[PDB]
């Protein structure tokens, strides 16, 4: 329904403008759920105020936290022309922070 519009996280209301939105979704191995990776500049996304590496919480009012890419990509196209994306900032959230590894040779 309409219980709760905005709260802790930021509401990113996307509005179809040119061909495809200004964001891109991708599935990462090991991780559960989809999120924004490519945020086109001065585009539909960058305009809505949606940052990258933001774990999806719900689309058009449909929790996608543990939703498969297929479920989302389909919910977005079906949604119609506009959609409501809700995610958290990359800084606010917390990811697996550890001594990253570089290139190995030998």
Whole-angstrom Cα distance, residue 12 to residue 19?
A: 19
Whole-angstrom Cα distance, residue 55 to residue 64?
A: 9
| Phi, psi dihedral angles at 10 (to 5 degrees) | -105, 135
Own/partner contacts of 64-68, CB < 8 Å, gap of 24 or more, are: 64/33, 64/34, 65/33, 66/32, 66/33, 67/33, 67/34, 68/27, 68/34
Q: Structural domain tally of the chain?
A: 1
Whole-angstrom Cα distance, residue 54 to residue 35?
A: 5
User: DSSP H helical segments within the chain, as ranges?
Assistant: 44-48, 69-79
**Any idea of the CA torsion for 98, 94, 25, 59, to the nearest 10 degrees?**
160
The answer to whether the beta carbons of residues 15 and 48 sit under 8 Å apart is yes
CB count in 10 Å sphere of residue 104:
5
Please give the method by which this entry was determined. NMR
Pairing of strands 54-59, 25-26: unpaired
Length of the chain (residues): 106
The domain in which residue 28 lies consists of: 1-106
């Amino acid at each position: 329904g309409s219980s709760g519009s905005s709260g802790q996280p930021r509401l990113c209301y996307l509005v179809k403008e040119g061909g495809s939105y200004g964001f891109s979704l991708k599935t990462v191995q090991g991780k559960k759920g989809v999120y924004m990776t490519d945020i086109t500049p001065q585009g539909v996304a960058m305009r809505a105020g949606v940052l990258a590496d933001d774990h999806l919480i719900e689309v058009n009012g449909e929790n996608v936290e543990d939703a498969s890419h297929e479920e989302v990509v389909e919910k977005v196209k079906k949604s119609g022309s506009r959609v409501m994306f809700l995610l958290v900032d990359k800084e606010t959230d917390k990811r697996h922070v550890e001594q990253k590894s570089g290139p190995s040779s030998g």
